[PDB]
C-alpha cells in the first residue's frame, strides 16, 4: 500500500532481502507464505499495479492471534485473485473450511426459494437483517483505488440508487457535507459509519482520502441501507424490527436485482465469477459476502455449556449487539450464519431460519429447567 506499492528499487533487492519476518504471526497469509512462494510471485503485478507486497502487507503488520485467525491479506482489484492465486487459493481453502480451487460457488438470490422464516418468534427475535458487499467491475478495490476511481464509483452508485422507487425510494447522504443533525439522525438509525480504526484495515491503505467519495444511502422506510466506498465499493443491508426474515430477505434480493439492472443499463456490472462468487477486498467475504442474522434474547442458552457447540452444529455464530454506547444488555446475542463461500444466499438464510427456530425451542426448555440434550442437532 501507499507509495511502497510502486517502489521500483525492490527490483534490485533479492527474495531473501525482501521476504517478510512472519515469525510471530498467526494469520492465514502467514501460514501460507513461504520463501518459494514469495520468490515466485514478487515480480508479478496486476494490470493496475497491485503487487504481492500490497496483498500481504496487512498480515505482515498485524500478526494476529490464535483465538480467531485473521486472513492477513487483501485483493486490490479483480485480477488479484488470479495473478496471486498461489497465495489466495490456500488462504481461501483454510479460511473457508476446505473450499478448493476446483470447487464451484452457486449464487441464489431468488427469495421464493427460502422456506418459512416469516415467523421467527418476536418474543425472542428483536430484529432481523441480511447484509452483503459488492464490487463494481473495472475499478480497483479500496486498498488500491485512486481518488478518481472512488469518485466514479460513488457517482454511478448514487445515480443507480436515485432511480430506485416504491418501497426502495430513498436519499443519499455524503459524509463530506453531512450536517450535525443528519449525523446524529443516522446515528440514531444505526446507519452511520465512521473512518475505520481497525489496524487490519488501516494497514491495507483503504482509508486514504477520508471522507472523499464515501456516503450513506437509505430508503425512506429505513429498511434498506447502502454504504458507499467504505470497506468495499458497496455494502448493502436489508433489515426489519421483528422476526420476518423472509420479508427482509425478499427485500434484500429485489434491491440487489434492481441495482444490478440499473448498473447494467449504464454498462457496469458486479465482479463475480463461478469459483469465488462475488469478489470483495477480504478473502473472508467471498462467495456471497452474506451475513444474515438476528438480534435475539437467549439468556439461558447464553449461559449454557453447550451453546457454542449447538451454534457450530447449526453453522451459526454469535457476537454481542453494538450500535451506539449506553449500557450493558443482558442475554441478547447477534446470531448469524458462519459460512460465506460454497453455500448460496438462500442456503445461508435457510440455515439462519432453521437454526434460530431450534435455538428458541432450546431456550424455552431452559426457561422451564428442562434438559436440551434431546434437541442437540446433528452437524450440518
Residues marked as binding for ATP?
Answer: 127-131, 190, 235, 291, 319-324, 334
Of the residues 33, 54, 130, 363, which one makes contact with a copy of itself according to CB under 8 A: 54
Q: Decide if 83 contacts 39 (C-beta within 8 A).
A: no
Question: What is the residue-wise DSSP string for 109-138?
Answer: --GGGS-S-S---TTTEEEEEEEEEE-BTT
Q: Which of 11, 68, 328, 378 binds a copy of itself (CB under 8 A)?
A: 11
What is the closest distance, in whole angstroms, from the C-beta atom of residue 327 to a copy of itself in the complex? Answer: 29
Site map (CB under 8 A) of a copy of itself, residues 147-166, x = contact: xxx-xx--------------
Closer to a copy of itself by Cβ: residue 26 or 57? 57
Q: How far is the CB of 40 from a copy of itself (least distance, A)?
A: 15
Determine the distance from the C-alpha atom of residue 91 to the mean position of all C-alpha atoms in its chain, rounded to a whole number.
17
Q: What is the grid cell recorded at 71?
A: 486472513
Q: Does 334 bind a copy of itself (CB under 8 A)?
A: no
- 282's CB contacts (< 8 A; 6+ apart) are 71, 74, 75, 231
Which of residues 91, 111, 203, 359 is near a copy of itself by CB under 8 A? 203
Cβ partners under 8 Å of residue 9, min gap 6: none
Stretch that binds a copy of itself, among 44-52, 122-130, 305-313, 322-330 (CB under 8 A): 44-52
DSSP H helical ranges for 122-279: 147-161, 180-189, 199-202, 245-265
Q: Binding residue for a copy of itself (CB under 8 A) from 31, 208, 222, 364?
A: 208
Query: How many residues bind a copy of itself, per CB under 8 A?
Result: 53
Q: What is the DSSP letter of 30?
A: H
Binding status of residue 355 toward a copy of itself by CB under 8 A: no
> What is Dmax (Cα atoms) for the chain?
71
According to the binding rule CB under 8 A, does residue 198 interact with a copy of itself?
Answer: no
Helix (H, G, I), strand (E, B) or coil at 157: helix
Candidates 34, 35, 36, 49; binder of a copy of itself (CB under 8 A) is 49
Question: Is there binding between residue 14 and a copy of itself (CB under 8 A)?
Answer: yes
Which residue number, 49 or 331, has a Cβ lying nearer to a copy of itself? 49
Question: Which 88-147 positions form the footprint of a copy of itself (CB under 8 A)?
Answer: 140, 143-147
Q: Is 149 helix (H, G, I), strand (E, B) or coil?
A: helix
**356: nearest Cα among 217, 245, 194, 215:** 245
Query: Does residue 216 touch a copy of itself according to CB under 8 A?
Result: no
- Residue (200 or 253) nearer to a copy of itself, CB: 200
Applying CB under 8 A, the span of 45-53, 183-191, 277-285, 300-308 interacting with a copy of itself comes to 45-53
Closest separation in Å from C-beta 84 to a copy of itself: 13
Residue 41 Cβ vs a copy of itself, minimum distance, rounded to whole Å: 13
Task: Please report, to the nearest 10 degrees, the dihedral formed by the alpha carbons of residues 339, 74, 231, 292 taken in order.
Answer: 0
Task: Decide: is 34 part of the binding site for a copy of itself (CB under 8 A).
Answer: no
Among 70, 127, 204, 336, binds a copy of itself (CB under 8 A): 204
* Alpha-carbon span 158 to 282, nearest angstrom: 24
d(CA 51, CA 123): 51
Q: Which residue number, 22 or 332, has a Cβ lying nearer to a copy of itself?
A: 22
Nearest to 279 by CA among 350, 202, 340, 200: 340
User: Minimal distance in Å, beta carbon 315 to a copy of itself?
Assistant: 34
Cα(35)–Cα(19) distance, integer angstroms? 7
279 in contact with a copy of itself (CB under 8 A)? no
CB 126 within 8 A of CB 332: yes
Which three cell numbers mark 282?
477480504
Q: Which of 159, 188, 209, 367 binds a copy of itself (CB under 8 A)?
A: 209
Q: 345, 257 in Cβ contact below 8 A?
A: no
Calpha distance 99→182 (Å, rounded): 43
> Residue 287's beta-bridge partner residues?
277, 278
Residues near a copy of itself (CB under 8 A): 1-11, 13-14, 17-21, 43-51, 53-54, 57, 60-61, 76, 140, 143-149, 151-152, 176, 202-205, 207-210, 212
Amino acid at each position: 500500500p501507499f507509495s511502497n506499492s510502486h517502489n521500483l528499487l525492490k527490483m534490485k533487492y533479492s527474495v531473501d532481502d525482501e521476504y517478510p519476518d512472519l515469525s510471530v504471526h498467526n494469520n492465514h497469509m502467514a501460514k501460507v507464505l513461504t520463501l518459494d512462494l514469495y520468490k515466485k510471485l514478487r515480480d508479478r503485478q496486476t494490470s493496475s499495479g497491485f503487487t504481492l507486497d500490497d496483498v500481504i502487507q496487512t498480515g505482515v503488520d498485524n500478526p494476529g492471534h490464535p483465538f480467531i485467525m485473521t486472513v492477513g491479506c487483501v485483493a486490490g482489484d479483480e485480477e488479484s485473485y488470479e495473478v496471486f492465486k498461489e497465495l489466495f487459493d490456500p488462504v481461501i481453502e483454510d479460511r473457508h473450511g476446505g473450499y478448493k480451487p476446483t470447487d464451484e460457488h452457486k449464487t441464489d438470490l431468488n427469495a421464493d426459494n427460502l422456506q418459512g422464516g416469516d415467523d421467527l418468534d418476536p418474543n425472542y427475535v428483536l430484529s432481523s437483517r441480511v447484509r452483503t458487499g459488492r464490487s463494481i467491475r473495472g475499478f480497483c478495490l479500496p486498498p488500491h483505488c485512486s481518488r478518481g476511481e472512488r469518485r466514479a464509483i460513488e457517482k454511478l452508485s448514487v445515480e443507480a440508487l436515485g432511480s430506485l422507487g416504491g418501497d426502495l425510494k430513498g436519499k443519499y447522504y455524503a459524509l463530506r457535507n453531512m450536517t450535525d443533525a443528519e449525523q446524529q439522525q443516522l446515528i440514531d438509525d444505526h446507519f452511520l459509519f465512521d473512518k475505520p480504526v481497525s489496524p487490519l484495515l488501516l494497514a491495507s491503505g483503504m482509508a486514504r482520502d477520508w471522507p472523499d467519495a464515501r456516503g450513506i444511502w437509505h430508503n425512506d422506510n429505513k429498511t434498506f441501507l447502502v454504504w458507499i466506498n467504505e470497506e468495499d465499493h458497496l455494502r448493502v443491508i436489508s433489515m426489519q424490527k421483528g422476526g420476518n426474515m423472509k420479508e427482509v430477505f425478499t427485500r434484500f434480493c429485489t434491491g440487489l436485482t434492481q441495482i444490478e439492472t440499473l448498473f447494467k443499463s449504464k454498462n457496469y456490472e458486479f465482479m463475480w465469477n463461478p469459483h469465488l462468487g462475488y469478489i470483495l477486498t477480504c478473502p473472508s467475504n467471498l462467495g456471497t459476502g452474506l451475513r444474515a442474522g438476528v438480534h435475539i434474547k437467549l439468556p439461558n442458552l447464553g449461559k449454557h455449556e453447550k451453546f457454542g457447540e449447538v451454534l457450530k452444529r447449526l453453522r451459526l455464530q454469535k457476537r454481542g449487539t453494538g450500535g451506539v454506547d449506553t449500557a450493558a444488555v443482558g442475554g441478547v446475542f447477534d446470531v448469524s450464519n458462519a459460512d460465506r463461500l460454497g453455500f448460496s444466499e438462500v442456503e445461508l438464510v435457510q440455515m439462519v431460519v432453521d437454526g434460530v427456530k431450534l435455538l428458541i425451542e432450546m431456550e424455552k426448555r431452559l426457561e422451564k429447567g428442562q434438559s436440551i440434550d434431546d434437541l442437540m442437532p446433528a452437524q450440518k
